[PDB]
Amino acid sequence: GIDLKAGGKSKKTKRTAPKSDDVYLKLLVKLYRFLVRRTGSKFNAVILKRLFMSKINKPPLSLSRLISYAKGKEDKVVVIVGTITDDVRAYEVPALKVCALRFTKTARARIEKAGGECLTFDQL
């Protein structure tokens, strides 16, 4: 015998792939698996890990909060693994470069009118 807990095996469970059946999400997962393997980038690793997460673990970000966080960094590409929703409490929308899994119609229209772009993760 060997004095080990559960024979030395792990007892923690984490996501290793998306539980969703979305083919586009699967393709994104393949893309970022390749990126993580062949670049060793911490950003890519974080993106890959978040691509596996459930719905409640990918909460949306409001447009007003996005503007507040992007203030002073409009030249950088803001990236969220989740949805971006419109906020009727935000009056002035600056030009922003935004990447997300999905945009609501109102948020996309407001960003495009303000002069930004809505990007997917392949474009990112």
């Binding site: 015998g1 060997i2 004095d3 080990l4």
Partner: protein, 193 residues
Amino acid sequence: QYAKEYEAQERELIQLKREARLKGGFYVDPEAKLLFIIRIRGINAMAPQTKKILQLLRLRQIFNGVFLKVNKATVNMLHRVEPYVTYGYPNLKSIRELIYKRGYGKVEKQRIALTDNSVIEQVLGKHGIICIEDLVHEIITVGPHFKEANNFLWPFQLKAPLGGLKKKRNHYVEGGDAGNRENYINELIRRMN
């Protein structure tokens, strides 16, 4: 250089003993700085303190062996588990044979056989240990990086004793096997390796 150093050390010890006799006094040998400890009892029906100490010593299986630097703390820890282990002062031959035949290094928490000096260099290169002989010298002399080298060494998985044991339920002093058998651990290592 290491071989010359070992030979010179043995000669110096003999000369010191002889000169002490000639002067008519006594020469007290330096206390052992290194111990080799072998677990001799199974994992059944373990007391909490004994089990915890054996885990801290990295002796999780019967007939596992490990080196241990001699310290007040380590000696007091070993005193608590004395009935479950037998230990002593390893020889240069014992250490060399153990590392050569059953020496496995820990790389990324994996057990890799020491088939090349590159395995040792990858882990202990920062400390100047890049060869099996360097590792042996560090272990035997208890050098500055002894802790790193010893932790790098995976616990030795020794076979059952070739000639058996006398009685593992009694101390070595009473004619059993448990406890400190000092210089006599080397013959046990011969039979167990």
